[PDB]
Amino acid sequence: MKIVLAYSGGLDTSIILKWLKETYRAEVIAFTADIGQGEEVEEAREKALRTGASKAIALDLKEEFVRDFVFPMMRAGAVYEGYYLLGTSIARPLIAKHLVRIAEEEGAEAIAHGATGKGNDQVRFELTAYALKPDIKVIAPWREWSFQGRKEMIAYAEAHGIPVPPYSMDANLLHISYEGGVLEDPWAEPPKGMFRMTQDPEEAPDAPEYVEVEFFEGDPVAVNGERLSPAALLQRLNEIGGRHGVGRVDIVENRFVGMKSRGVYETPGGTILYHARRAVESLTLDREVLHQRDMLSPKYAELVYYGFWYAPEREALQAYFDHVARSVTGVARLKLYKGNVYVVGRKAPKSLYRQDLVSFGYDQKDAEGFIKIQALRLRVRALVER
Amino acid sequence: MKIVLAYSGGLDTSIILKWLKETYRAEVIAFTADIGQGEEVEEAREKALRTGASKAIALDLKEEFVRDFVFPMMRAGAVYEGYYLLGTSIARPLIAKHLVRIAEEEGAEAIAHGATGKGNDQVRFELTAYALKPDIKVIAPWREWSFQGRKEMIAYAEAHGIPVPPYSMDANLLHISYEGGVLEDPWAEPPKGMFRMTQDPEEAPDAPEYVEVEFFEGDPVAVNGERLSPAALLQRLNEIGGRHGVGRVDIVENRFVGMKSRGVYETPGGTILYHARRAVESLTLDREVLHQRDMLSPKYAELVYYGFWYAPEREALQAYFDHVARSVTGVARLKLYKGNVYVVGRKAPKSLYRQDLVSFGYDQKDAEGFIKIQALRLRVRALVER
Amino acid sequence: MKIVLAYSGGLDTSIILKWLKETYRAEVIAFTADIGQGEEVEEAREKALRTGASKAIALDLKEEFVRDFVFPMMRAGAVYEGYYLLGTSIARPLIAKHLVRIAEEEGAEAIAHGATGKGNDQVRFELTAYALKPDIKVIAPWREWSFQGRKEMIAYAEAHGIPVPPYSMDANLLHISYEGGVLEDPWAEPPKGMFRMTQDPEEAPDAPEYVEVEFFEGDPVAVNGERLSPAALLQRLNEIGGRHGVGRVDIVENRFVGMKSRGVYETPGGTILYHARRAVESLTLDREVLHQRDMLSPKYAELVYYGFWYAPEREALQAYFDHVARSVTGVARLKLYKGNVYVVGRKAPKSLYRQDLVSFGYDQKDAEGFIKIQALRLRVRALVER
Amino acid sequence: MKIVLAYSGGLDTSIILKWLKETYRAEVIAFTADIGQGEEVEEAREKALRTGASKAIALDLKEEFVRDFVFPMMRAGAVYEGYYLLGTSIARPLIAKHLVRIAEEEGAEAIAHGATGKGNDQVRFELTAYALKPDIKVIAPWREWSFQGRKEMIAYAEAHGIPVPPYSMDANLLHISYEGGVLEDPWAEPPKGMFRMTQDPEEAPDAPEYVEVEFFEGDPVAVNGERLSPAALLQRLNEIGGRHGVGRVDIVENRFVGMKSRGVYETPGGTILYHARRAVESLTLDREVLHQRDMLSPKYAELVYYGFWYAPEREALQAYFDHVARSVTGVARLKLYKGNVYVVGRKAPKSLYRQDLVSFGYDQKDAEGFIKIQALRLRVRALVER
Ligand SMILES: Nc1ncnc2c1ncn2[C@@H]1O[C@H](COP(=O)(O)OP(=O)(O)OP(=O)(O)O)[C@@H](O)[C@H]1O
Ligand SMILES: Nc1ncnc2c1ncn2[C@@H]1O[C@H](COP(=O)(O)OP(=O)(O)OP(=O)(O)O)[C@@H](O)[C@H]1O
Ligand SMILES: Nc1ncnc2c1ncn2[C@@H]1O[C@H](COP(=O)(O)OP(=O)(O)OP(=O)(O)O)[C@@H](O)[C@H]1O
Ligand SMILES: Nc1ncnc2c1ncn2[C@@H]1O[C@H](COP(=O)(O)OP(=O)(O)OP(=O)(O)O)[C@@H](O)[C@H]1O
Ligand SMILES: NC(=O)NCCC[C@H](N)C(=O)O
Ligand SMILES: NC(=O)NCCC[C@H](N)C(=O)O
Ligand SMILES: NC(=O)NCCC[C@H](N)C(=O)O
């Protein structure tokens, strides 16, 4: 038996690699993806071999991540429960996709991940796996073993020769998530120094910085006049937004499995992109189109959050969003200053704005007719009330 | 003939007062509302009499404004096209409501206002008027007179003893709007020193300020432990938020009459309230209720923006929002710093958050069944696609 | 140990009654609800004591069923996937509500039901049970036992001395559902003579029959001038409609648990009510209110179908629907003829219909201005495409 | 000046033709479109040149109508206010399209239509025109002339030698609309014998008739195994459905211009197509995709109704609806009888239905886990309510 493990290189997944070998008497093929966690994935691939993997695979998936997952999601203007830009949410489907493919190539009947049974990650990995390969077998050790606590897990690791180095983290090219431990008390502010991707706003530059982001048919293609590939572009904006402490959010969210959870997120580059996109859309999108799009975004957001990425409902909404986004071509100019992002300008080759219609053709007399007709049903309602 | 004029006290409404008397051979009853514009309404009242009004009325409507218009709107989480907190939008219905009441008390067949034929305010005023009193006659001089240019307007005023004096402004307790003039170029950043209600972030304190806002059944009732009436509470938050320069937005919006317009807004207190409310809701609102509520907010927002306040659609949705909002009871803790409003904590008497559900009753294995069932239709789809 | 069982008096819930006694060795309180199945619940209550119940309770819940479940649901215009009027769906919550109530009165720690593991009913009973009493224990024999066939169940029945006898049925005052067996082939028309509640249209009266339904504030209060209580009213309309073979539906629906199921339903009285309501709503509901209401109806429907009756989202939506329904006061006149229901007239004390508005409410130029303004954005769009 | 007139051939439109030659002293180009009104457009054409047209054009647009307008709309499941299948609505855009093309070809400056200022048709013609050619000049005689009363128009008619004679009618391949006159009283059943396209139910065949419709990627391509072009197919279904009295609707609808109107419609072929499509969708569309689509259908419906065919909102939604409809391939089997349409069967080469999922990837214990997780938030809620 062969099992393809999503190996992040940490303590828990290393414990899982061991546990899988013994419990299933299986050959474990470790897969580590580089999606911008800021870590030498090759080191995790070597640790996996030391830990007992019969084979270790590491891939640079940053470009595929931004191009095929992050960009499509952003076109939708996806925001979960008012703030979450879904940094972890869109990354999981990608990893699950490669697990299934690798499982297919290696003749492995199962795949494994180390997401716990009380989070959303388990759902994203499995819904993806099942949607792509219906009869694949999935093993989630956190839902199968019986370790009674951290202590017991540390002992198991030590006993297996696994190095055993106040909150949990998940990092990638889009954001860094923080939750658990000290963060579990929603009345407690996150501890000073926790943030890594963004600079403390209190330590940000004393001078604001301007940045321009160009969009072509829905996707950002340039920063300050320099054309950059999807992954290189997100990275550049993370650097620029990061230095100024942009993109910090603190929320108590609703997990798909039913309980509320306190999460803290930093999405410097994505936050700039959120406002840059809406800035360009403000010149290129039609009013009714915009309003309809915004009322569907939330639904799309929960689909991503819940894990329905490779799902027909999400693909269907995607058809709508992509259609709408094709008109998003132009440039957004933003001003960054101590944690904040300010839109200060925007332009587009096919802008729908006409100073013609606001400055003092158009006939004010038309407005009276418009108002009279719009008011008809209201007046009838009033007359009936009497 | 008696005409009740919404009289702001400026040059144009003064010109209008004179214009109405002669054009309609009628007496004009001027009505100036104090909704927090930051001016002495008694001075407008006195000027109205000097300009020729047979009667001038001035009322302090700050409490009614915040209590009966601002709060109900905020409960719905109303946000127009991603950023506009509707500062001017919710104030107009209030004014028109009084215009119609005064017309009935005075025996006036008509009411008048000085909103132009190319803006949104004309619609708000008229839809309100017609909704409350369907047989009311409305007179909008901008859509009726023959003035050709601003120069002829000054001459007309000077000739009538009316005193004569970059962008246009509208200020009240909720915000200050800036549009027109140099702002008409969407690529140009607004001019330095334009903002009045908020201090530039560059000048804001280097020390962040923590602020707590208590919510009771959907409405903010206290700030930092001090109970404040609606208007006094908004005022307080405008002061605290204003000093830190919070609540500035720069957008190109879609007017109801059809054209795009570049608008700049500062809503210090309202912006704090927006995030404070969501912070309390994150503990007091059920997941599914929240998601539904958020998908209806944009619709309610456009209704307010278009002027359908005293309209059945709006009141129907208000029934939904008010039902939901009633559960919003608790305290939000925010950190204000150079333009930003950061949520750092939240608590509630009946919080739905359970640390025992995230900490490491609930059974991991239940999750497997959940996922399997959730995945069935996706697996069937995959098998059919063969 | 005590266990309150939702006992319908049939072969399986009887088998289940025996099974529970042997499996748990607990006293089993049988509960049988009269919701219009057209059965003598006293016979079931005696067969229960006969079968082994330590106590058998039978309650007439017809009025509560229609008044507190069917009517509130109908005010929302609830329709699942185009045709299902949710006859079985709104019934289960009522039953579960009593099971929990009894268990609390009898000091029983657990409740049980005979819904299978492949359907929706299991979810409805349980979500209702847990929502009302969070720590109540639920037992679902179909998910726990070992019978591997019908033959084994019958054998087990005789072995225990229980009376033993092409599709499954569920009947109550709202409808009769038929699914399973022969119906599992979606290309196969249901068998002749299957329907019980409605008379085959080809054997229905040759002369159409007219019926008038009076609505008051959202609920039907009279039929052909006769004031009838909720249950008596639904009953009366089942008679009138059944006679004509009205309300037959055949669909392949999506169960909440993942798979498609072929269902056939007969809802005579409810189908008349569906159309009578809309007829009265056509004169009493504002255009925008209706349009918004209709876009929410489908959501409320799936909530009812999935089993989220005693859930915050449904109750929140209910506040919106009840608010709108309050205006639905008037009379609908329908024509019934061989399986079909035809609206032929409607009137209302506060009808918003005005013949003077259509006869040959505004000036002609008014419509021109309305059109010009509505067209503005389309013309700008065209010009930009230049 | 040249004026292209959408000329139907009736009394009113012939008068308009004279009025235009006389009032404007312009060279009138008549345009009659054959869209299945059941009339020799060649006659209308000759009656035009006769009446005074400097030219008359008649075009057979039946195929374009069904293929480019009716099908895309049906693909969306468009239904206005619960019953209206939009027969007249989707036709107007087609006519205005050619009106504008002809005017461009004939170098005309204006176009004219005979829709009154009280209805929706004026909006449909004009929004379409402006959207296609923003500079187009539009003339609506009903809004510009001075006739008061039917008598006057007759006089002016008999004066120029034009042929002169209970309700108004509009017919095309999709339906026949009846409104006005005796129909204006909502409580008054339509007059016996009014219907033309549909045989009266009471005089419909004594034996039911079965019919099958094949769909390929969203559109019906055959009837009873016979492949038929869009128009030929709608024609055939009109014949079959017509003989049985299928597709009659009687409603009080809300016009875009503000007032309620009592309309009666007969859409035999279209009604069969509506139920056939949903029958094929029941096997070919995913649950969540279907539920989302249905919540959007009503919006698309009002778009069509209001006249926003060639509008960005509609085209954006069309992308979603077309994406979803591409999966709709299969066959629906319906039973027609005495005015009703009963779905009795359906099949699809890629059906998502699996009998093995319902008959006695799916395990028992799974349902329990699903239920528990789904119930969590409800349990927490109850607990908090103590
Ligand atoms: N870069 C990666 N490559 C492959 N799989 C990954 C990667 N990052 C995360 N995963 C998968 O996602 C699952 C993990 O979650 P999380 O990111 O919450 O895991 P951990 O890193 O295992 O635990 P923690 O940091 O909370 O102690 C992992 O157990 C692993 O299977
Ligand atoms: N505080 C107020 N009290 C009464 N009416 C008001 C008030 N503020 C605005 N209005 C009404 O709204 C209409 C105005 O618009 P806007 O607010 O755009 O006017 P202005 O151009 O600011 O003022 P003015 O017309 O005096 O020069 C006014 O002409 C007036 O009729
Ligand atoms: N009238 C009723 N009173 C109480 N519980 C009922 C009633 N009707 C249905 N139920 C509950 O719903 C569950 C049943 O389902 P269904 O209606 O699918 O059962 P059956 O299998 O058709 O009938 P039976 O098992 O009694 O022969 C039952 O096992 C029972 O717990
Ligand atoms: N077959 C057609 N070809 C071209 N234009 C048409 C056609 N049918 C209708 N129209 C256009 O649509 C507008 C009409 O409406 P309707 O179809 O309601 O008009 P009528 O036929 O003019 O009036 P009536 O109610 O008396 O029959 C017409 O005035 C005409 O300009
Ligand atoms: N530290 C973590 O394990 N966080 C992973 C991201 C969790 C986040 N609440 C999400 O659902 O996407
Ligand atoms: N300065 C102004 O006249 N602005 C008034 C508010 C206009 C704003 N765009 C609104 O529509 O509410
Ligand atoms: N015979 C049955 O057990 N049917 C009960 C109704 C099932 C229906 N499909 C529902 O889900 O409500």
Ligand SMILES: NC(=O)NCCC[C@H](N)C(=O)O
């Ligand atoms: N007879 C008519 O003139 N009817 C034209 C169609 C009217 C229909 N109520 C519609 O709005 O489409």
Ligand SMILES: N[C@@H](CC(=O)O)C(=O)O
């Ligand atoms: N990654 C965490 C959190 C989550 O999945 O939501 C876990 O595995 O539980």
Ligand SMILES: N[C@@H](CC(=O)O)C(=O)O
């Ligand atoms: N107050 C401005 C702007 C607006 O009403 O939208 C006007 O009268 O035009």
Ligand SMILES: N[C@@H](CC(=O)O)C(=O)O
């Ligand atoms: N009553 C059937 C069908 C359903 O519940 O949906 C069962 O118990 O499976």
Ligand SMILES: N[C@@H](CC(=O)O)C(=O)O
């Ligand atoms: N065709 C009719 C009705 C409508 O347009 O709605 C008219 O011209 O008024």
